[PDB]
Amino acid sequence: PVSSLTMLNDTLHNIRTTNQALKKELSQKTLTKTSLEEIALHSSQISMDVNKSAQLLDILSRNEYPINKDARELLHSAPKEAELMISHRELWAKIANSINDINEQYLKVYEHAVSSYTQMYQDFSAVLSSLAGWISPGNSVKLQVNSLKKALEELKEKYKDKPLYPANNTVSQEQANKWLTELGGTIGKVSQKNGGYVVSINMTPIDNMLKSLDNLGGNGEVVLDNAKYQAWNAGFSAEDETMKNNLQTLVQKYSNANSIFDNLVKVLSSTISSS
Amino acid sequence: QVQLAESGGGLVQPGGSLRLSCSASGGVFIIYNMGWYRQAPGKQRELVASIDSYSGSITNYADSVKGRFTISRDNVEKRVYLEMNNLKPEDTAVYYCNANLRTNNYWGQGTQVTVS
């Protein structure tokens, strides 16, 4: 019975409470405008509760509170991402930083990638809804190619300096590349920003659209045969699924990174409930 | 070039509400960030609501307006809306609608909104 362990126990259970609430927001076909808003609240609550836990874990380290051998056996179940015969104080510190780096440099990375790509695909879906106003039938089908390319080109522009990672500032090539491999070379692309690098959104799906439109020819508005229209729309709809699957990929990488962080808490919570 | 035209103004009593509407015609409506402005007699122009291009997820309002106005956009029909609830006398002004993207800016003539 120690106040620091009790306050830690309760803070960790409040984390597992937020983790579950975030798993709900992440399992929905549509990540609406509100979905990102909810994801932000839970993330900010996790961040400040992890900060409180660290401050509590710090107390336990400097005071060298014992971690019984019956409890050190449970820290083996901690995910290998946590990086867990060492001193009592060194192990409490080896946790406060573990739980803190699992959030800043691991969990929150997937969070921003999701939001960055969610915003991008949200704005693209607006181009999708506005296609009704750029396609007129007469078979015959008139297409406002210029208006559509301008829309897609300004989508690329609006997100050139909004990378999947990092959220702020830059990182090293070996750091941008190491995260590119985890997210996917098809969803992102390392890019130079000022002196360092980032993991920018990969806009190849939109680039492919612009190439297909340039191939339709014409000098502005283009009238297609019925077969030439179903052909274009098929490739334009296939690129839509590519981005929709790219986003589903990030969501799973995020919810899985949450399940890991959650088990790092489940293990920790059971490690203090004993000691 | 984009042509803007606002409609829906008029006289209301304090606590009343309006449905301000701006219809656009011309360029690519979807790429422009929209924003409603107002200028009361004598006083200086003011930004009241703003919405970004495309889906329009990002919106912020002036402190004197939050919770009462709401800005939305219809890319399909190419119109910008500003529903105004619980209107106060200080909300009296000519409300203009702005389409903006980098240095590109387009304006409608604006509607009068009087609350008394």
Cα separations in angstroms, A38 against A33, A43, A105, A107, B114: 9, 9, 21, 16, 37
Q: Kindly determine whether residue A154 and residue B31, on different chains, have CB atoms separated by under 8 Å.
A: yes
3-state secondary structure of A275: coil
Domain ranges of chain B: 1-116
Structure resolution, Å: 2.8
Please name the residues in contact with A150: beta carbons below 8 A apart, sequence gap of 6 or more.
Answer: B27, B28, B31
Q: What is the CATH number of the domain that holds A4?
A: 1.20.1710.10
Torsions phi, psi for B104 (to 5 deg): -80, 130
Residues in A closer than 8 angstroms to B101, CB to CB, are 154
Secondary structure (DSSP) of A232-246: HHHHHHHHHHHHHHH
**How, if at all, do strands B93-101 and B104-107 pair?**
antiparallel
- Name the minimum distance, in Å, from the CA of A146 to any CA of chain B: 9
CA-based nearest residue in chain B for residue A131: B76
Amino acid at B94: V
DSSP B18: E
Alpha-carbon span B49 to B59, nearest angstrom: 7
Q: Kindly determine whether residue B30 and residue A33, on different chains, have CB atoms separated by under 8 Å.
A: no
- Structure determination technique employed: X-ray
Q: Which of A34, A119, A154 to mutate to test the interface with B (most CBs of B within 10 A)?
A: A154
- Does any CB of chain B come closer than 8 Å to the CB of residue A154? yes
Residues in A closer than 8 angstroms to B54, CB to CB, are 122-124, 126-127, 155, 158
Alpha-carbon span A131 to A186, nearest angstrom: 25
The answer to whether the CB of B95 falls within 8 A of the CB of B110 is yes
The answer to whether the CB of A143 falls within 8 A of the CB of A194 is no
- Name the minimum distance, in Å, from the CA of A7 to any CA of chain B: 37
* 3-class secondary structure per residue, A149-194: HHHHHHHHHHCCCCCCECCCCCECHHHHHHHHHHHCCCCEEEEEEC
Output the six-digit token pair for A203.
């806009």
Of B28, B53, B78, the CB nearest to A158: B53
3-state secondary structure of A222: strand
Q: Which of A123, A146, A159 to mutate to test the interface with B (most CBs of B within 10 A)?
A: A123
3-state secondary structure of B73: strand
**How, if at all, do strands B18-25 and B3-7 pair?**
antiparallel
* Terminal Cα distance for chain A, rounded: 9
- Name the minimum distance, in Å, from the CA of A153 to any CA of chain B: 9
A164: domain range? 1-275
Q: Which of A129, A135, A153 to mutate to test the interface with B (most CBs of B within 10 A)?
A: A129
3-state secondary structure of A231: helix
DSSP B15: T
Is the peptide bond prior to A137 cis by the omega test (within 30 degrees of 0)? Answer: no
The rounded radius of gyration (Å) of the Cα atoms in chain A is 24
